Design a protein around this ligand. Structure first.
Ligand code: HEM
Ligand code: HEM
Ligand SMILES: Cc1cc(N)nc(CCc2cc(N)cc(CCc3cc(C)cc(N)n3)c2)c1
Ligand SMILES: Cc1cc(N)nc(CCc2cc(N)cc(CCc3cc(C)cc(N)n3)c2)c1
Ligand SMILES: C[C@H](O)[C@H](O)[C@H]1CNc2nc(N)[nH]c(=O)c2N1
Ligand SMILES: C[C@H](O)[C@H](O)[C@H]1CNc2nc(N)[nH]c(=O)c2N1
Ligand SMILES: [Zn+2]
Lengths: 404, 405
């Protein structure tokens, strides 16, 4: 009933009791595990019991569980749902909910920071114009001249009678991908489709490898609108290498701020279709995935040739050697430019501390092993040797369909 | 779409559906409420006969004689044997098919492209520990083939009703001793402290090195295990050196050629083979990353980084990643120089992708444990990282079994 969870490096055992609080089914069954899938295929009464559960979470968090303020808030929500089929969160509850969604996020290795999150309430937004202003403030706040600060901005919730507020971009800052005649891509191949949408909605495209995309913001039931981010708001870091001088000449660069803008924040049965959030990078995201993935910037071979490695055979481990230097260039360049970054060793070590904190606090912590273990040097980090239980707790970040 | 798991490769954008998981007759550890996929060990004549029938059906399908007289007659023969004895026995070619199918079905093995090429040694006539030793020595000689390694398995008699099991106490046929020191530390391989201490208790005179090959503790039914030293000339080892770092040879590191698992249960059609050691060749990351660099194993990362003169006082110099790469390169280079079969993690995972494609066409899927298939260094640099995988238990299977002590 309660899974035994072992660390194979240290020989220590815990039992996860938190997982019994999951009310939401994942993709696995006893016949087969689908834990490696990225996206698997998945009324008053239901809303009212999610609302109640969450309000119960909130009053318990402020050690006022059972008080008058608690009973009366439950009645307000009941009264509101029974009349209108929905209800609204107080700001303090929203702040609690956002932090809890982050805490509960099984694919996030940065969760030791969960208690430290700036929550901007943007639920009084009524136009794409206003959305843009809120997004510009978020970026300015979060960026903080390189001293990055975790933030979320929460736009108006989904409503039965109408379309969603949506940010069409997957991140607030992304580079364009331009499909060429010859079928190759100039820029970031992950972004070809959003780049084409921006052009279709009136953007004058660039022609570089690192052109920052405009935002396509959508107010309910209206065509999305295009807004260019003022270049001064978008902090970027040129990549150099500590010892390899030719590396700067690659002209490589990356932006400071990872800010997810296409996920749905669910709190107490309410759904927030636009709720972009940002922290700071772990270096492997840039060094290994963004720059080295074969379907991304795919620079490995170029770096290897510059390093004069033998690219003829896999057994020279030229790929591994080049990937290491690229990750080192990322860490050094962010450190030089005084922009917050964490390496995968420091990050996984802080995650292990988080696992221990959450064991004491809640009797468990949902974690997706495949996402927590970094994409290089897996077993050289302490998380490789740690068993993990994966389940869905609410409040939660979820995937949602693309608006187009 | 189709009512089967949809499986995506995120590098290539291609999709498949796994229909093979429909054949699974055994539950894994996951439920809709929680995924337990990362757990290393997840926790009568009626049951036997249905398992036997199933296996015999698998056999007759594979030789394209499904529904035939010979098929119906073998079915009849199996249930009559079970009806009078409680068990039955496999024909020789049924054992061959079953052993290969068990390797084919193993979700955690990246080497499965080779599955059809497995020498099956039938040792079901073995009746003593002395004879097990002879059989094991012959397996080692054949499998090692002076460096040109060959996949093999040796199968000892099956579990019987109210008779003891054949067991090899060692987890592998070749392992290094781990000696617990007075300071609490371990000289040798810390993974092998317990088996080393069992060998000593059973009369082995222990060495005092970092790479002492362990003796075999072999158990015939209802007898105490008996101790057997492998004659050194049979155990091929590879001294470790680096292609450009000249001091690496001075570390005195080495590893053995033959990875041979000896504590797993081979299950075929309800029958349980408690002693059935099998061997392949190494993937280089097994040695260079896990055996040598695991903090709870030889733990040599720091030593090697100091020699390379790296900054070991901070994580952001990536000293661990740099040392690990050179240790891995040294492993590959030394095996190559010594002419001993080895495969790097890039060639292995590329061949595994080919195997997934083969099995898609042959069987409509392939059970795979993502966390085990993706190598422990350079994960996303290999094609399997971007491949979604479905994990399920098919039979015939290799299973874990409790330690005999
Ligand atoms: C403070 C710095 C943070 C670091 C270093 C960090 C680290 C990471 C990493 C490495 C991933 C996997 C990224 C990928 O491979 O796509 C991730 C995922 C995720 N993080 Fe964080 N995180 C941070 C802050 C945050 C914040 C502030 C939130 C929200 C309030 C958050 C919520 C999430 C969610 C929902 C995912 C899963 C995204 C997906 O499924 O695509 N994290 N985190
Ligand atoms: C031919 C060369 C082979 C290669 C390169 C190879 C590769 C591997 C690797 C790297 C692992 C994971 C090892 C670990 O991290 O503990 C593994 C596991 C496994 N392989 Fe292979 N393999 C080969 C041959 C074989 C053979 C001949 C068999 C049996 C007939 C086999 C069956 C298994 C099984 C049952 C496991 C799971 C062990 C466990 O759960 O602890 N493989 N293989
Ligand atoms: C469209 C899409 C869907 C899906 N399931 N997975 C991806 C993978 C790529 C990716 C997508 C997003 N939206 C955000 C990140 C950064 C993740 C991140 C977030 C934060 C807050 C900090 C940090 N260091 N990294 C990476 C894309
Ligand atoms: C602590 C622990 C307990 C337990 N029961 N199982 C494990 C898994 C680790 C492992 C255990 C054994 N016995 C053999 C290998 C070599 C795997 C191998 C086999 C073959 C045949 C070829 C190859 N390249 N590698 C790996 C760990
Ligand atoms: C198929 C596989 O599950 C997929 O490639 C996952 C693996 N682990 C990951 N881990 C992180 N952090 N981010 C990812 O995008 C992925 N991709
Ligand atoms: C906790 C985790 O399940 C455990 O460390 C696994 C991860 N993947 C592995 N993969 C392989 N091939 N071998 C292993 O021993 C492990 N260990
Ligand atoms: Zn699962």
């Amino acid at each position: 009933k309660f899974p035994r969870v072992k660390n194979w490096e240290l020989g220590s055992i815990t039992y996860d009791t938190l997982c019994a609080q999951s009310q939401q089914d994942g993709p696995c069954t006893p016949r087969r595990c689908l834990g490696s899938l990225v996206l698997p295929r998945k009324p008053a009464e239901q809303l009212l019991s999610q609302a109640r559960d969450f309000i119960n979470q909130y009053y318990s968090s402020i050690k006022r569980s059972g008080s008058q303020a608690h009973e009366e808030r439950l009645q307000e929500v009941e009264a509101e749902v029974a009349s209108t089929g929905t209800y609204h969160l107080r700001e303090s509850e929203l702040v609690f909910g956002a932090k809890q969604a982050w805490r509960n996020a099984p694919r996030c290795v940065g969760r030791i920071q969960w208690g430290k999150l700036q929550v901007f309430d943007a639920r009084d937004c009524s136009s794409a114009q206003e959305m843009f202003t809120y997004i510009c403030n978020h970026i300015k706040y979060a960026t903080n001249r390189g001293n990055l600060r975790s933030a979320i901005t929460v736009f108006p919730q989904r409503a039965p009678g109408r379309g969603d507020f949506r940010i069409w971009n997957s991140q607030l800052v992304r580079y364009a991908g331009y499909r060429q005649q010859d079928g190759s891509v100039r820029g970031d191949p992950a972004n070809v489709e959003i780049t084409e949408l921006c052009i279709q909605h009136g953007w004058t495209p660039g022609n570089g490898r690192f052109d920052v995309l405009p935002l396509l913001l959508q107010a309910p039931d209206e065509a999305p609108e295009l807004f260019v981010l003022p270049p001064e708001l978008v902090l970027e870091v040129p990549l150099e290498h500590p010892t390899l001088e030719w590396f700067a000449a690659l002209g490589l660069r990356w932006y400071a701020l990872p800010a997810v803008s296409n996920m749905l924040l669910e709190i107490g049965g309410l759904e927030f279709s636009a709720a972009p959030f940002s922290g700071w990078y772990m270096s492997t995201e840039i060094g290994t995935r963004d720059l080295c993935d074969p379907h991304r910037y795919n620079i490995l071979e170029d770096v290897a040739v510059c390093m004069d490695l033998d690219t003829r055979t896999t057994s020279s481990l030229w790929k591994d050697k080049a990937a290491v230097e690229i990750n080192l260039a990322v860490l050094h360049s962010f450190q030089l430019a005084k922009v917050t970054i964490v390496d995968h060793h420091a990050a996984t070590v802080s995650f292990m501390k988080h696992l221990d904190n959450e064991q004491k606090a809640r009797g468990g912590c949902p974690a997706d092993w495949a996402w927590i273990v970094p994409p290089i040097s897996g077993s050289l980090t302490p998380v490789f040797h740690q068993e993990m239980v994966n389940y869905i707790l609410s409040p939660a970040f979820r995937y949602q369909p693309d608006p187009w």
